[PDB]
């Protein structure tokens, strides 16, 4: 239909793609906002899903320490699934390498703060997946953030996030 | 600037001076002027790119002078004149620093 070109770049000045935009509708008819994620939040939820499905298989045949955890979830993965997920091994290595918080509670407190701030979701998810403590340097890194946010507010959020998160 | 505050002021036959007052702060926008503005902005942008290529020292000097927040009277002398003359009355001017969002030359061009 008209071949509908629609050239679009992905950036943080609310320059978001159509294919993953914000307001969708879920299949029951309720509105489906976009779920963007933090690196430490993803690091938590992969463990949550893994322990949930592992206990699900425990019921099936019945009827945060990263060095142990990566290899343990690996052997849990080749317990049932295949060994082809070398790139998925690379992904949780990336998650445990650069995720801003190793512990769950700092991430939970940050999200509890952000649920009150009501910031832009993709913006603050990019900020959370990034691991830095310098707001002006982050603005020099991403001129999209430099144009969007004031440096004073950026650092006033960054320090009260930086004191909480596990420094590396 | 160079007038005595306690001089004597007289006006003659300014019974239609309100029109001069009106045009003192009124302005119009045309399409060709917009086109000339686009062309001038592009020319300035390419000149800034060329200057950043050949010698970024002057641009960095201007940028740090803006970081200190100097102004037209601060930097310019008398023998040089400001390009964009002060459109507003001096009682209403801004005298603080340039924001970082337009502080860089490229930032101001994109602005």
């Amino acid at each position: 239909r008209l071949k509908k070109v629609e050239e679009e770049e992905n950036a943080a000045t609310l320059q978001l793609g159509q294919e993953f935009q914000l307001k969708q509708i879920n299949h029951q008819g309720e509105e489906e906002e976009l779920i963007a994620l933090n690196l430490s939040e993803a690091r938590l939820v992969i463990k949550e899903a893994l322990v949930e499905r592992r206990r699900a298989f425990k019921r099936s045949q019945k009827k945060e320490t990263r060095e142990k955890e990566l290899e343990s979830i690996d052997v849990l993965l080749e317990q049932t699934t295949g060994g082809n997920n070398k790139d998925l091994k690379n992904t949780m290595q990336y998650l445990t390498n650069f995720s801003r918080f190793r512990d769950q509670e700092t991430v939970g407190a940050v999200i509890q703060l952000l649920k009150s701030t009501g910031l832009h979701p993709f913006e603050v998810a990019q900020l959370g997946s990034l691991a830095c403590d310098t707001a002006d340097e982050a603005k020099t890194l991403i001129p999209s953030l430099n144009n969007k946010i004031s440096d004073d507010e950026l650092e006033r959020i960054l320090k009260e996030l930086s004191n909480l998160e596990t420094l590396y | 600037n160079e007038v005595s505050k306690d001089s004597i002021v007289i006006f003659d036959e300014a019974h239609n001076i309100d029109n001069v007052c009106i045009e003192s702060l009124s302005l119009d926008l045309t399409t060709d002027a917009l086109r000339r503005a686009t062309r001038g902005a592009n020319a300035l942008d390419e000149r800034i790119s060329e200057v950043r290529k050949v010698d970024s020292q002057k641009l960095q000097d201007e940028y740090e002078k803006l970081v200190q927040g100097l102004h037209s009277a601060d930097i310019l002398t008398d023998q040089e004149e400001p390009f964009v003359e002060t459109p507003v009355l001096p009682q209403d001017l801004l005298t603080e620093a340039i924001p970082g969002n337009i502080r860089r030359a490229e930032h101001f061009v994109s602005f």
Binding site: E9, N10, Q24, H27, E32, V45, T80, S129, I142 | -
Partner: protein
Amino acid sequence: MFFIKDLSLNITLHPSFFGPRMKQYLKTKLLEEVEGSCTGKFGYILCVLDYDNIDIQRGRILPTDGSAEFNVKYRAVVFKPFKGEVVDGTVVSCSQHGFEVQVGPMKVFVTKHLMPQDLTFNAGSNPPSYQSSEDVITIKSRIRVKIEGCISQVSSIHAIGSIKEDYLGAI
């Protein structure tokens, strides 16, 4: 970057697998052809969410074959390789005209023209190290690369990148 959304799949089932216990059988099939997979629309498909209360509930027998078609709706995690922002990836392999950075799942390459010309690249390195101050390509090799564009194709994902920017290549 990684994304969460409800997503739909259509799956065939051979008529030999019409045994009395097929719901968890379909759940297993959903597992090994969702986990560890790549596409163009959603990129690398990482793992599934919402293992319970999943949505299949009904299926049609195909006309010409005893295969039964099913429609599966599920929450999941994928990866969306963007363009134009910084990632601190790792490099495993290198070429003569640029290094190949493995930022997680894919292998993004930077051409010898996409590296800055003032980077002091020495070809006599193992791997060929495009280092100036600190970004020496190692087994770790945390290199801040910006994806110029992850070009999307048929389900084999490829990306391009460069380090011609301040703190790009530099962490």
